[PDB]
Amino acid sequence: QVQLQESGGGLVQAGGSLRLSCAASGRTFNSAVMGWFRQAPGKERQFVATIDWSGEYTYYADSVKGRFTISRDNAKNTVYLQMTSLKPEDTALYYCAARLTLGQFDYWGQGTQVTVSS
Amino acid sequence: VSVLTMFRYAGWLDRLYMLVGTLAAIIHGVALPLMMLIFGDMTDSFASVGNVSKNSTNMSEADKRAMFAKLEEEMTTYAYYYTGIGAGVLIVAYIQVSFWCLAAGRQIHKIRQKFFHAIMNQEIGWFDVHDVGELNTRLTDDVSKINEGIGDKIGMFFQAMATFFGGFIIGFTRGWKLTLVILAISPVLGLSAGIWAKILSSFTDKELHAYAKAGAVAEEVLAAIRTVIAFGGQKKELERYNNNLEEAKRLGIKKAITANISMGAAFLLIYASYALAFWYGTSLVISKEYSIGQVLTVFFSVLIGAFSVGQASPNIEAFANARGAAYEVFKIIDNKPSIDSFSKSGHKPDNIQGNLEFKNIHFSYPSRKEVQILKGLNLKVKSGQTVALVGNSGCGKSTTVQLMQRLYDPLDGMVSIDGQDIRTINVRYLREIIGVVSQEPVLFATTIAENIRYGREDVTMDEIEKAVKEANAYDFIMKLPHQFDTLVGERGAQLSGGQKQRIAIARALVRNPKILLLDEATSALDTESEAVVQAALDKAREGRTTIVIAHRLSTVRNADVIAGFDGGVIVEQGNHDELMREKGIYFKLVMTQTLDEDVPPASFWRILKLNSTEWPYFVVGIFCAIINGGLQPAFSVIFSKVVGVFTNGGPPETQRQNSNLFSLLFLILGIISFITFFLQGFTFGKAGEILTKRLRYMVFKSMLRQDVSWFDDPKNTTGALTTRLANDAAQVKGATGSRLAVIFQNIANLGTGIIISLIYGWQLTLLLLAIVPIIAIAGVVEMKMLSGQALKDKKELEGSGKIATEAIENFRTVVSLTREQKFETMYAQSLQIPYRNAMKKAHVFGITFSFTQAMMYFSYAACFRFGAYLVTQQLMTFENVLLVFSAIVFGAMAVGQVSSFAPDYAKATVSASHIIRIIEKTPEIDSYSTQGLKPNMLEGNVQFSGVVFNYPTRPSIPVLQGLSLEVKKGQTLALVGSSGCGKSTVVQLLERFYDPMAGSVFLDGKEIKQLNVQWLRAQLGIVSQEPILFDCSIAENIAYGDNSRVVSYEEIVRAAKEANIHQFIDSLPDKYNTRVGDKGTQLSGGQKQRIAIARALVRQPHILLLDEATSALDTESEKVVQEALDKAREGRTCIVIAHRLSTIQNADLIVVIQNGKVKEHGTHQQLLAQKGIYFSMVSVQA
Secondary structure, three states: OOOEEEEOOOEEOOOOOEEEEEEEOOOOOOOOOEEEEEEOOOOOEEEEEEEOOOOOOEEEOOOOOOOOOOOOOOOOOEEEEEEOOOOOOOOEEEOOEEOOOOOOOOOOOOOEEEEEOO | OOOOOOOOOOOHHHHHHHHHHHHHHHHHHHHHHHHHHHHHHHHHHHHHHHHHHOOOOOOOHHHHHHHHHHHHHHHHHHHHHHHHHHHHHHHHHHHHHHHHHHHHHHHHHHHHHHHHHHHHHOOOHHHHOOOOOHHHHHHHHHHHHHHHHOOOHHHHHHHHHHHHHHHHHHHHHHOOHHHHHHHHHHHHHHHHHHHHHHHHHHHHHHHHHHHHHHHHHHHHHHHOHHHHHHHOOHHHHHHHHHHHHHHHHHHHHHHHHHHHHHHHHHHHHHHHHHHHHHHHHHHOOOOOOOOOOHHHHHHHHHHHHHHHHHHHHHHHHHHHHHHHHHHHHHHHHOOOOOOOOOOOOOEOOOOOOOOOEEEEEEEOOOOOOOOOOEOOOEEEOOOOOEEEEEOOOOOOOHHHHHHHOOOOOOOEEEEEOOOOEOOOEOHHHHHHHEEEEOOOOOOOOOEHHHHHHOOOOOOOHHHHHHHHHHOOOOOHHHHOOOHHHOEOOOOOOOOOHHHHHHHHHHHHHHOOOOEEEEEOOOOOOOHHHHHHHHHHHHHHOOOOEEEEEOOOOOOOOOOOEEEEOOOOOOOOEEOHHHHHHHOOHHHHHHHHOOOOOOOOOOOOOHHHHHHHHHOOOOHHHHHHHHHHHOHHHHHHHHHHHHHHHHHOOOOOOHHHHHHHHHHHHHHHHHHHHHHHHHHHHHHHHHHHHHHHHHHHHHHHHHHHOOOOOOOOOOOOOHHHHHHHHHHHHHHHHHHHHHHHHHHHHHHHHHHHHHHHHOOOOOHHHHHHOOOHHHHHHHHHHHHHHHHHHHHHHHHHHHHHHHHHHHHHHOOOHHHHOOHHHHHHHHHHHHHHHHHHHHHHHHHHHHHHHHHHHHHHHHHHHHHHHHHOOHHHHOOOOOOOOHHHHHHHHHHHHHHHHHHHHHHHHHHHHHHHHHHHHHHOOOOOOOOOOOOOOOOOOOOOOEEEEEEEEOOOOOOOOOOEEEEEEEEOOOOEEEOEOOOOOOHHHHHHHHOOOOOOOEEEEEOOOOEOOOOOHHHHOOOOOOEOOOOOOOOOEHHHHHOOOOOOOOOOHHHHHHHHHHHOOHHHHHOOOOHHHOEOOOOOOOOOHHHHHHHHHHHHHHOOOOEEEEOOOOOOOOHHHHHHHHHHHHHHOOOOEEEEOOOOOOOOOOOOEEEEEEOOEEEEEEOHHHHHHOOOHHHHHHHOOO
16 A cells, blocks of 8 residues: 655766655554665665654664755655765665564665766 | 273272173183083083994884983083073173273273373473374374273183183193193194294295385386486386396295295194094093093183183283383373472462562573573563563564463573562462463454453453453454354454454453563554554553563554563663664664375276286186185084094994094095195295286386376375385285185085085074074174274264364463363363263173174074984984084184185275276377488477476466577577576476477477477486486496497496596496495495486487586585586587586576576676676675
């Protein structure tokens, strides 16, 4: 009954700002947060950032922190992460994922591929 | 002590009746020789009468006076005889059977109730150890054995001893000589039977050793079936299996020969000793005048008493095996070692709560050597709060919840409910104060009302209502028909699991515990019902001191205190915010994760038809069985004439007559019987022998010439096939042995017996056959009622056993404990029916055996009654009376032998039914043509287009779907896939092990579908993961004749040279002639594989196939084998599916196959330029 789409996923060179958003529509109210991913072929899947649908704060990865930002719709369920200063390393498929009470990722979405150069 | 007393324990009045019945068994066994003592007394007077009757030739009327006076007096005795013995044996029979039932019933019922109680009373231990099911299986089979152990078998045992010791008492008392003679023949008769046991035991192992070879050949061949098929080495195994059968048959015939020698000599010594007993018994009459022939027959009855000892031995073995198996497990069976749980006493807390306190608890699961899952613990949860536990590696939280119910006494430390230790309070009460909700719910088969009623025994539907209504389970149940009375059918899978768990919650809610334990109740559940049930738990929370463990973190949000473990090791404790503040383990896990056989259909006389078809001639065996058949009654006739003329005849000529009949009894039996018995044994022995050959031949060849999902993908197994080869032929061998045995006793009784019967007064015949068939039918209907009761009993205990196994298989009942006594209550009520049925069969088995013996005296009555009286009246003769006894021993050897060989005919008929349907086969592919093998047929460029396939499990997710490949000649075609099949299957399909469901495959462009099977398998490079090496000369292993190919030394030399196995070949004794040493126990995988490679390149295939050849290997072996493979290929087409991607780097065409669908194809660098499955495969290779 769930699914998460993404908006803004495209191409840009090093030093550009790529603002993205993750739309989450389905049924859940207990702690379903919105979280983003990044993966590269021939390699495992790494995580990005995650705001808690509680009212606390966000969790940035020790790779992307300092650069990336995140947000909310504020009237509805979405997460807008502004991607500031993307290195050619960033180049990966980004797929937003939602919380599970269990706390192990059981929710997934469409994703989007992002290509970075110089 | 523990051996006997406990076996017989309790039964206060039972032990008493046990003794009354025993006593009656004694006087029963005592009665039989007394009946035969009477036989001498009636013989005595009748003999004295006969002596004067022939001594006359002067006076007639005097014989009409005194002889008839004596005969009338004897008739007067007769009347008090059959009656006097009959009423006695009737009553004491019903009593001794009452032993079989009335005592065993109460004993077994007591055993069952105590056993059934103690099992549930062992608690934890069954989870700690043993079989938990196989145990309760065998145990109930042992208690089943007890009924055989404590039954009338004992009564029969004492009866037997009464006939033995009581028989010999009379024997010794009435003379000590004849005793000595029979005692002298005792070791002798025991000596011949000693030859039997030595011969049987020795010849069995030889045949077993012989068939072991045939079995070993059948063992590996059927395992190597895909290999022998691919190489077409069938006809050689055919020949060898015929040679081994030839030897097993020669040991079979020698076994039969020696066997017949033994049984023959044994009977020689028996009849010889019997004759010697008579020769000296008579010698004590004619000149001596001691015995009148009473004891002469009675000592034969002493022989019948020894046979009673032979009937005694099984009863002891029935008792002992019941004793030994039971008393040894009885120590486990009874009492209550317990001492960690029990049911009773202890302290009853009225404080109805207690702040839970965990203090320094060190524990280890009873896996013994397994490390402590929980090392140390400190947790203190204030009353009314809800503490949440978490972990990663698993369990360690579950241990603490398990300890809280006192299911396991901690190794060190203590767990304190309230202020007191948990080990002081009564366990039952503790269980009543502790509610538990497990992640996986279970519902017993009963109404939802009853499953709740299992929570608390005394309850009303109003409380049920409030329970489910507060548990919000009152919606779907109302909508559901039958409402609360709705049964949960077929165990617990009926309705939604969330609803199931919700009901379990209502059950724990009725319990109104002051402690609530939730283990992952929300875990493993759909999201919607999760939220519903969660809401139910929440309304079940906040009201009861509780401890909750789950991996669902949303419900942990509102928890008052959280405690981290991750493996059971305690680290952090406190509120959520404080924890996130610490950014520790809690924050880390939250945020990081964000064999049986034999189908029914029968033979129906096709048996002897196919047998005779395969049995070319044997009329001398059966005719010899006929002359031996008619040979048997002559003994019964001669002896009848011996005592006959001895009874009626005068003092003159007694010597000549008795001597002549003695010698005739000698030559007619001892000389002739040994001859005819050994003659037939030599005939039907070799008959069954060659049948054993031809049958297994025509079977195994029918097996090898057909594959087609009987081999490629059978639901059967190798063992079942070898089993078929053993049992089928052995059974039909017994079928024919029974054929000749039956025709033999057939003429032996019916044929000669009718002739003897014809010379009676014709009334005597009718009266006699007014007995034998009647008592026969009475014994048959006895057997029928017997099995009918055994079966209905089996049904009752079946049901009770089912609900019992239901209980013991579900250990979760111990968490409630409410059902501990309740279950044994229901079991009590269940066992009550067979109890009354046990009482029912007391009357039933009692009357049957009684009546059986009621016909016994009644038989002897009418025999001698009518033998006297009316026959005494006019023309009383010495004959026709002993001829009755002859007809009797014929009815005895009739019933005895026929009933003995009856089940032999059954299993054989069934076994024959199997062997017949298998040999019909469906020959399919053998040779034929389909092509003329034109001189222009080679290349080796193999096509695959749109090929789908499934191995014969139809909806098995066919591994090949929409598959197409191509490979040029003289080059290597690489193959790689995820795991499992489609790798190997392509190779299998190339073997044409199974023709695909759709699509086609080509080799030269010709259709494989339409190609001949043999020549297709004539060129193949097949190499398996673990090549199976036949036991044989390694030289003969290396060269498997493809068709006409002789073993060629220079060729296999070239083979070793290429395979690099020539290292071992150069040196070591016998070189190439070296045997594999008992199934290749001398070689490692690399060596065997080298040999397999040599088998491949010997044939010089234009097509090679490698299935994970290097999969199992190491170090230099991998390189030398890879080198061999590489030099083997490149001269011809090859297909390599090997999982070594390090060695795949040299390939002409590499193909990435995705589950039936070819995904990517091309050279290494090209695919490397590409990206997908392949690059991941190399990346994961590292």
